[PDB]
């Protein structure tokens, strides 16, 4: 994978070349695109700007947010050729940064589960996850050092781990999600992926220009919470693999560590996540469920057929419940700096079985909306398994420092 | 003005058809739009559905908000003839109910301060208000039973106030602004237009489908307390001539009427909103700052200008600050059921000031999020003057409760 990091530390020093480094991301996008299909579309004009912290880091565009100059087809038939006329605000981030957005990523329709094309760089006759397949995939297979994507279940952090790449899901709302195809505006959050927590971070800093994503360090001794979310049913051996290597890694650099058990009222927040996300979806995409039906991806038609039913009533309600949810989770952070738990069910599934992953290890937290960051922690039989980092709201600085802390616990 | 449930009412019966009171507005548009200039495009061939309750049930629409059939030109030159792929969810929710939407109105340009060519119905030589001119002058001059608009300031209670129509504004979030031209995420808010709270409920239950507005009657002897924001500055005479003659009629139809203060954490939200509205407006509207800076109307122009050196620090600050302010407002409705108080500084602005007017009277209720329901009072000179009704946040349906009882107390 490419260092973000790395491309800026050398761009700076004049050791390496803006229009080098974007000339070596098209190569790397071209070398391997007939395998992994990560790219909807390669603006190969695309050049390095003049000035900025991004200048010279090309970044790939989930599909589903505007570009300008390129289309935005949401992974969908029913965009396709849609050529938006601004490009959203979170690529304008970018752009002022100094950024050349050299394409647009693949997304699952209107990003729920509907498989794309791509294929997973660690195994091409796996899945790369969803709904952020692109992203994750070009990242994974060292394409681009630099992605954006979203989450409203799980499309960030999944997608992330089953590609073996870093990313986070930032506190809800902090960056807009204008100019982002809604699925679930209580739920839909913007997120980046990168090789490193560092790469993460220095992409959050140029974006947003706060100063606690400047000089983050890797923490010390971070006192962690390791939660295994029994509510959200049982887990591959894999995964359970991957947590204890790196609640053992961490212990040796240092860390406290202690297993809590999450509240009664968090797991009910996790049981209505598919209530708020699917009662908005029928709204959010109103338009194209009454003049275009047939035409939506199957899967997504199939979940939205069967909950035209649901209820304002109910809708109320599973809000209710979310809000309780958040006030019991927020107790959690007294004694604990960071929660850790898996940031998938197992390994990537398999293409033959026509699934980009299932999210129910991620979905509570697009919900509770804490900073989520996936650190890749190994491998089984070639596969990525990663552990998923979570801070307190809004303390997205210190989610990265300690999965910072956690890859370098993990190397040694 | 035409009043939505009256034509539910007769439509109901079978005492006029649905193509019959579409051709009425078609007819009453056509009547006084060369005069009033409220509609940015109106289309002579919408037709009325055959069933939902608001079949033969004619919309405007605020120009900012994404409609298939016809253009949305956000009141810019910058998005001239530009044309979205979907309606937006809100138009989706009237559409879905039987409504027909006959035509886009007036909006000044992305909802700022730049006025639109639209004038006053009870006096052309007077503004409309803004940023909902078209929908309030529309609605305002018996053009249309119904208007959607938005308010991120005071876009939909103001313009309501000067025009003499019932309007409100929803608790925040209630309506989704998926589709609808952002100005700040944190406050834009949809709003309705029509002749009477009546006519608000009916249209709110059609969209929404939630009982809360099914079986709304006239409140009987509500506990109002009376605020008049002193915060803000004193009001013009007009404006205080109107409160007074509200109370009063409050009084003798039987309410309880109290003058209460605010607690000072509101004062402080009300301090705050141009932070959180103008450095949101600069990343939500950064596409068009970056590459057609010298396009955008001049006085948005002037304000994004001024207002580029807004901090995330000082932002974060200030949406502390209001979400301390909604909490304390809770409390505020303990011992009352709704807050009374001005709807707009005073009659409408000559045309000639070049001013849409000050949004100061509104703005605060929008960061706070409570529905905010205008009732006309009285005129002078024969220039509308209304109140503002506000209930607690969720509590929309006694809002328009208090509105219909205060219109019914008017009408002695």
Redesign the interface.
Known sequence: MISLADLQRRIETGELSPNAAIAQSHAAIEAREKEVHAFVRHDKSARAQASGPLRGIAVGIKDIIDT?NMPTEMGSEI?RG?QP???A?V???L??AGATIIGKTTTTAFASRDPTATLNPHNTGHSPGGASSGSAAAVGAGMIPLALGTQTGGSVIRPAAYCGTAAIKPSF?ML???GVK?YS?ALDTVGLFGARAEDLARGLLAM????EFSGIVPAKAPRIGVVRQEFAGAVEPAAEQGLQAAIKAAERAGASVQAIDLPEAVHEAWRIHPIIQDF?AH??L???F??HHDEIAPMLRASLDATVGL???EYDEARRIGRRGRRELGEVFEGVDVLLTYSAPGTAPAKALASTGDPRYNRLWTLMGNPCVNVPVLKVGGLPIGVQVIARFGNDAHALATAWFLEDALAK
Chains 1, 2 share one sequence.
């Open positions: 300008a965009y849609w006329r601004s490009d605000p690529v304008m981030m752009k002022r709302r807009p999600t204008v809604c505006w947003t220009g706060r100063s908005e709204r959010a109103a338009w194209e009454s003049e209820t304002p009533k």
